[PDB]
Amino acid sequence: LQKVELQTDVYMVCLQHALSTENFEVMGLLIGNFACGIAKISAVIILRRSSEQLLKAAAEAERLTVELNRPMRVLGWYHSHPHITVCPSHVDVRTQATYQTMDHSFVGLIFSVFSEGKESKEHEIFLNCFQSEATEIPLEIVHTPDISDRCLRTMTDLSKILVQEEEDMAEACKDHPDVLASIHNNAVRTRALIHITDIITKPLVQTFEKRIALNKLRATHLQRQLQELQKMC
Amino acid sequence: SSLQKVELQTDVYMVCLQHALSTENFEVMGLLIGNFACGIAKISAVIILRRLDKKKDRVEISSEQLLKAAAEAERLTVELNRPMRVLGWYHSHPHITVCPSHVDVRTQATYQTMDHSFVGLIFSVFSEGKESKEHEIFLNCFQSDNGEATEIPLEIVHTPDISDRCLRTMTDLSKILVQEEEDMAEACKDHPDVLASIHNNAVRTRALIHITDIITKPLVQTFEKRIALNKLRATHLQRQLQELQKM
Amino acid sequence: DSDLLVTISGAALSLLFFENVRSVGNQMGFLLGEALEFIVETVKIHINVEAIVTCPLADLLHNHINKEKLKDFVRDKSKQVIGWFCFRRNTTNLTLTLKDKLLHKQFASHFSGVNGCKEDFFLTCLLNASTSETSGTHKFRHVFLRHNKRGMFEPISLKINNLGDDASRHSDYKPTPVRKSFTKLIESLNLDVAGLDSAMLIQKAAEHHLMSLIPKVCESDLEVAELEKQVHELKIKIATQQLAKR
Amino acid sequence: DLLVTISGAALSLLFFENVRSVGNQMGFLLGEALEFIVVKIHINVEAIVTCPLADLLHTNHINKEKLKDFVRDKSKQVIGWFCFRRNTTNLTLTLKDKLLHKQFASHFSGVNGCKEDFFLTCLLNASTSETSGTHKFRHVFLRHNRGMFEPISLKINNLGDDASRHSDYKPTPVRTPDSFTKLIESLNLDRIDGLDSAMLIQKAAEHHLMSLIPKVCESDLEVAELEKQVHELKIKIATQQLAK
Ligand SMILES: [Zn+2]
């Protein structure tokens, strides 16, 4: 494995996933194609927090191979370091290591986030591309003209996962005989849902819609220029 | 007229202890009412106070609270046909030693410029060995000497019951807690954002239920079961009373 | 033998201590409560102490327990008995005495087969009180134990449920346990249903109920206090007589 | 004091536009400011838009006419501007920056727009190690207080912590419904009923979010197609003019 080419729209998904929580490490798998030393990453899977997870990620790559008509497979993994350095921990190197025994040229990506200065008030986000001690691999974030249909849907899947995590917990105390407990659990569950809608779902809705809106602003602007330039011919 | 000994009634003891057990995360505080005999502070009444500070060592009773406490004492004086006065204060040490802190000594010393025989009680709660499973609670009765705390001899005097006023004091705690919650929720009433109002209601309902579950319900159970188990002992003693008269 | 946790409220514990510090000498009595099971796949046991009652040990002996006398005292409340307690004064020692163990075994056996759940986790609560040299500092120690299957007495974790932490915080959701009066109050007021603001309505109803109980607690306290006084005097009157005849 | 807030969504989109950018990049910050008594002010950037600086100049002087033509009605929402530079790990304000912040701040300020004291300049850079195995992204929000710029704190609202926690209760603000507020009212909702409201909102949001994915794709293709056409046409007539 010589280098990695990570698409901007995938990069955006991973960053967005990293910025979802400040108090936990987040994780996901990378999908793409491996040619002559370089790994072109063009897809991404958001994971819960495995055997059943690998299956759904492997299934995705299979479905992408058919739909895009190009070889898609799980090329690597990524996970966030909130309040940490990009430097892969001992566990980061070990997890990356076991993956390489299963697959050479298997790349690991670390997204360090939520690191601000005391009085500086400057933020820093690092992206570390590594394999396994941790050895750095050359990385190049490659331009895309748009956000892929699949990358868009992946962003919305985090919203679904979080809500499903909450429904499963609420289900495990469904018919509590104590009225106080029952009222408590419902209040807890209500706060959790509105917390997901406010922090994750709504911001995603607003981002999608305003991108569409602002695209049209720029679009109409461009065609004003296209007419003014077409005059010269 | 020097403080020679404190006699603390067992039912007042129960109120303070119960108050201290309400939370292991914050210190609680209240005032003690009774009468000062020949060198003896006899403590037979208690007032549970509202604490606004979350400061770990900053436990201060306000001037407004002292006055209201004095009013209560004056009422007890009339109600029980007996001299009642504010004789001292108490607070809790969750997860720390019972020994008075620097702030505790400095605060007690101020009270003594107001009243030379003012009593200080500290209830230590929520300490236990991870291995033995054994729990310890200390009760320290102290005054402030030349910058240092010194022990005041303490006796917890037997009471045949839990007095009406001690029972009423216990019931005040949840009321106070609920009122604190109400005040906080009050500051954000009528929120224009639907998501935020739903959130706030969820928060308020959980906090209120929390108080009812941890505090109010148990106290209801404790009162009711005392009544029942007293009657059980009551009927037991009566059956025994017939047999002994036969002797 | 499956994870075990004892739980109690500040209200209940304060009543226990109250009853202890009231007593003239050492004191004994029973623990009343309920055992709950949770699945986490492993099963944990919560044994919650809801209330306590004192009893003169002599009213049950012969140092062998008189079962008929015990049945006679407990009387229908035996289903609620989940353990017993022993309070000792002027000692810091919190070790089970041989007599204590014999009483635990007897009590455990009795309520085991009858109604008081399994013999594995019948409880012995051991409490004591001591004071410093000036008596300015009073120390109160307590611990729960049980008789495990291997014939050993092992201490059990105690959780005093409070506003800062309680046993139900295994996530924030309170899990439903394995199936098998405050609620009677809510039901009588039809409060177990609701956009009424049920939390506030339940709390207020609790407050009102609490207020009507105060005179009842007082009334019963005086009643049992007078009877204790009358019984103690006769016992002394009878006791002195046997002295004279000896 | 003052505080800038933003979601992971919005922030991720800004970083996305920066990285896919051919050369250096500039644009405007959209959002809204709120005041909270306790008086603290939260400036929330809701979205960004990129714009060629060379499409707004006459020299270093900004053409306030061409600026209005671009923003076009959405000037109201403008609360700042951002500049993205490459490789330079430097995160300091240059002279041209301050001049642009002053110009922009004056243009969008006033009764109709945002407050001039609250206009933000956002600087962003992207560096890379020699091996190019580690990428460093640095950014900061700034404002003009006296006469010396000061960095303002940034809180990225997330599941762990958000600007609203300063208690658990959401404090009401002092004093134009977005698309989400529209969806809410669409449900005509009116506590245990608080749960039913929450679940319905969750489902509505999920369904609405999914119907946007196809719309977002088609907009990205339209704007990306027009970009290509304009870029080539410029080059076409430029090579022609250079010949004659
Ligand atoms: Zn203290």
DSSP string, D98-123: HHHHHHHHHHHBSSSSB-GGG-EEEE
Resolution (A): 2.5
* E strand or H helix at A158: helix A149-171
CA A112, CA A109: separation in Å to the nearest integer? 10
| Interstrand relation of B29-36 and A139-142 (parallel, antiparallel or unpaired) | unpaired
CA B102 to the chain's CA centroid:
22
The distance of A174 to chain C (nearest Cα, Å) reads 8
Q: How far is the CA of B143 from the centre of ligand 1 (A)?
A: 13
Closest by CA position to B207, among listed C155, A16, C203, D213: C203
Q: B157 is written with which tokens?
A: 């005097």
CA D134, CA A141: separation in Å to the nearest integer? 11
Which residues does C202 contact at the CB level (< 8 Å), separation at least 6? A179, A180, B209, B212, C186, C191
| Residue in C with minimal Cα distance to D195 | C195
Which residues does C159 contact at the CB level (< 8 Å), separation at least 6? C5, C6, C7, C8, C165, C166, C167
Task: Assess contact for B104 and B125: CB atoms under 8 A.
Answer: no
Question: Is any Cβ of chain A less than 8 angstroms from the Cβ of C96?
Answer: no
Distances (CA, A) of C65 to A200, C151, C209: 66, 20, 39
Task: Assess contact for A196 and A163: CB atoms under 8 A.
Answer: yes
CA B87, CA B239: separation in Å to the nearest integer? 44
Number of Cβ pairs closer than 8 Å across B and D? Answer: 39
Which residues does B220 contact at the CB level (< 8 Å), separation at least 6? C181, C182, C185, C206, C209, C210, C213
| Residue in C with minimal Cα distance to B159 | C22
CA C82, CA C51: separation in Å to the nearest integer? 10
Distances (CA, A) of A103 to A131, A132, A136, A194, D240: 11, 12, 17, 41, 54
Residues of C in contact with D190 (CB under 8 A): 195
**C156 phi/psi in degrees, rounded to 5:** -120, 135
Q: C15 is written with which tokens?
A: 């009543």
Question: Is any Cβ of chain A less than 8 angstroms from the Cβ of C175?
Answer: yes
Task: Kindly determine whether residue B187 and residue D169, on different chains, have CB atoms separated by under 8 Å.
Answer: yes
The distance of A131 to chain C (nearest Cα, Å) reads 36
Q: A65 is written with which tokens?
A: 């191979």
CA A108, CA A77: separation in Å to the nearest integer? 5
CA C124, CA D4: separation in Å to the nearest integer? 59
Q: How far is the CA of C88 from the centre of ligand 1 (A)?
A: 29
| Residue in B with minimal Cα distance to D36 | B188
The half-sphere exposure of B75 on its side-chain side, counting CA atoms within 13 A, is 9
Task: Assess contact for C91 and C138: CB atoms under 8 A.
Answer: no
Closest by CA position to C202, among listed C217, C220, C183, C219: C183
Question: Is any Cβ of chain D less than 8 angstroms from the Cβ of C192?
Answer: no
Q: B203 is written with which tokens?
A: 């928060």
Question: Is any Cβ of chain A less than 8 angstroms from the Cβ of C198?
Answer: yes
Spell out where B154-245 has E strands.
154-157
CA D35, CA D173: separation in Å to the nearest integer? 6
Q: How far is the CA of B59 from the centre of ligand 1 (A)?
A: 7
Question: Is any Cβ of chain A less than 8 angstroms from the Cβ of C199?
Answer: yes
Task: Kindly determine whether residue B240 and residue C160, on different chains, have CB atoms separated by under 8 Å.
Answer: no
The distance of C173 to chain D (nearest Cα, Å) reads 15
Q: Which residue has the tokens 């009764």?
A: D111
CA B13, CA B8: separation in Å to the nearest integer? 7
Closest by CA position to A218, among listed D178, D222, D105: D222
Q: B117 is written with which tokens?
A: 């025989």
DSSP string, C1-52: --EEEEEEEHHHHHHHHHHHHHSSS-EEEEEEEEEEEEE---EEEEEEEEEE
CA B38 to the chain's CA centroid:
25
Q: B159 is written with which tokens?
A: 């009471």
Task: Assess contact for C53 and C85: CB atoms under 8 A.
Answer: no
Question: Is any Cβ of chain B less than 8 angstroms from the Cβ of D171?
Answer: yes
Burial class (CB in 10 A: 0-12, 13-18, 19+), B135: buried
* E strand or H helix at A152: helix A149-171
Distances (CA, A) of C230 to B237, C225, C239: 9, 9, 14
In one letter, which amino acid is C34?
E
Where chain C is discontinuous (C–N > 2.5 Å), the residues before each break are 40, 62, 170, 180, 194
Q: How far is the CA of B150 from the centre of ligand 1 (A)?
A: 15
Task: Assess contact for C33 and C50: CB atoms under 8 A.
Answer: yes
**Residue of A173, A179, A189 lying closest to C175 (CB–CB):** A173
* E strand or H helix at A8: helix A8-18
Question: Is any Cβ of chain A less than 8 angstroms from the Cβ of D51?
Answer: yes
CA A162, CA C64: separation in Å to the nearest integer? 61
Tell me: is residue B210 an annotated ligand-binding position.
Answer: no
> Phi-psi bin for D132: left (phi > 0), alpha (psi -120 to 50), beta?
left
Task: Kindly determine whether residue C173 and residue A179, on different chains, have CB atoms separated by under 8 Å.
Answer: no
The distance of B177 to chain D (nearest Cα, Å) reads 15
Q: What is the DSSP-derived secondary structure letter of residue C58?
A: G
CATH classification at residue B107: 3.40.140.10
Task: Kindly determine whether residue C175 and residue A183, on different chains, have CB atoms separated by under 8 Å.
Answer: no
β-pair partners for D45: D31
The distance of B102 to chain D (nearest Cα, Å) reads 29
Q: Which residue has the tokens 């245990």?
A: D192
Task: Assess contact for D47 and A212: CB atoms under 8 A.
Answer: no
Q: Which residue has the tokens 């004064």?
A: C89
Closest by CA position to D62, among listed D92, D111, D97: D97
DSSP string, chain D: -EEEEEEHHHHHHHHHHHHT-SS-EEEEEEEEEEEE---EEEEEEEEEEE--GGGSB----B-HHHHHHHHTTGGGGEEEEEEEEES-------HHHHHHHHHHHHHHBSSSSB-GGG-EEEEEEEEE-SSS-EEEEEEEEEEE---SEEEEPEEEE-SS--TT----S-PPPP----HHHHHHHHTT---HHHHHHHHHHHHHHHHHHHTTHHHHHHHHHHHHHHHHHHHHHHHHHHHHHTT-
Residues of A in contact with B213 (CB under 8 A): 180-181, 184
Task: Kindly determine whether residue B26 and residue C164, on different chains, have CB atoms separated by under 8 Å.
Answer: yes
Interface residue of D191, D195, D196, D197 to substitute, partner C, most C CBs within 10 Å: D191
CA D133 to the chain's CA centroid:
29
Q: What is the largest CA-CA distance in chain C?
A: 76
Task: Kindly determine whether residue D192 and residue C197, on different chains, have CB atoms separated by under 8 Å.
Answer: no
Closest by CA position to D42, among listed D95, D107, D118: D118
* Exposure string over B109-124, b if 16+ CB within 10 A, otherwise e: bebbeeeebbbbbbbb
Q: What is the DSSP-derived secondary structure letter of residue B20?
A: H
CA A84, CA C134: separation in Å to the nearest integer? 54
Q: What is the largest CA-CA distance in chain D?
A: 77
CA torsion angle D25 D28 D34 D40 (round to 10): 40
Q: How far is the CA of B88 from the centre of ligand 1 (A)?
A: 14
Which residues does A9 contact at the CB level (< 8 Å), separation at least 6? A144, A146, A147, A148, A151, D16
The distance of A230 to chain D (nearest Cα, Å) reads 8
Task: Kindly determine whether residue A146 and residue D22, on different chains, have CB atoms separated by under 8 Å.
Answer: no
Subunits with at least 3 CB pairs below 8 A relative to chain D?
Answer: A, B, C
Task: Kindly determine whether residue A206 and residue D180, on different chains, have CB atoms separated by under 8 Å.
Answer: yes
| Residue in A with minimal Cα distance to D180 | A202
- Specify binding-site residues of A for Zn(2+): 79, 81, 92
Q: How far is the CA of B94 from the centre of ligand 1 (A)?
A: 9
Task: Assess contact for C37 and C44: CB atoms under 8 A.
Answer: yes
β-pair partners for A73: A32
Q: C157 is written with which tokens?
A: 């974790």
CA C185, CA A90: separation in Å to the nearest integer? 57
The distance of A136 to chain D (nearest Cα, Å) reads 5
β-pair partners for B31: B47, B89
**C112 phi/psi in degrees, rounded to 5:** -65, -60
Task: Kindly determine whether residue A169 and residue C198, on different chains, have CB atoms separated by under 8 Å.
Answer: no
Tell me: is residue B91 an annotated ligand-binding position.
Answer: yes
**Residue of A181, A187, A194 lying closest to B195 (CB–CB):** A194
Q: Which residue has the tokens 């019972």?
A: B98
Task: Assess contact for A212 and D219: CB atoms under 8 A.
Answer: yes
Q: A1 is written with which tokens?
A: 């494995």
Residues of B in contact with D184 (CB under 8 A): 194-195
β-pair partners for A42: none
The SS3 of residue A194 is helix
Question: Is any Cβ of chain A less than 8 angstroms from the Cβ of C172?
Answer: yes
CA A8, CA A14: separation in Å to the nearest integer? 10
Sign of CA dihedral B29, B33, B36, B42: negative
**Residue of D168, D172, D184 lying closest to B194 (CB–CB):** D184
Which residues does D197 contact at the CB level (< 8 Å), separation at least 6? B194, B198, D187, D189, D190
Task: Assess contact for A73 and A61: CB atoms under 8 A.
Answer: yes
Tell me: is residue B236 an annotated ligand-binding position.
Answer: no
Which residues does D5 contact at the CB level (< 8 Å), separation at least 6? D42, D43, D44, D45, D154, D155, D156, D157, D162, D163
Q: Give the length of chain D.
A: 244
Closest by CA position to D119, among listed D181, D41, D194: D41
CA A80, CA C182: separation in Å to the nearest integer? 48
Experimental technique of record? X-ray
Q: Which residue has the tokens 């009422």?
A: B75
Closest by CA position to A109, among listed A61, A74, A77: A77
**Residue of A169, A177, A180 lying closest to C173 (CB–CB):** A169
Tell me which residue range forms the domain holding A34.
Answer: 3-149
| Residue in A with minimal Cα distance to D6 | A203
Q: C116 is written with which tokens?
A: 């008081």
Question: Is any Cβ of chain A less than 8 angstroms from the Cβ of D92?
Answer: no
**A37 phi/psi in degrees, rounded to 5:** 90, -25
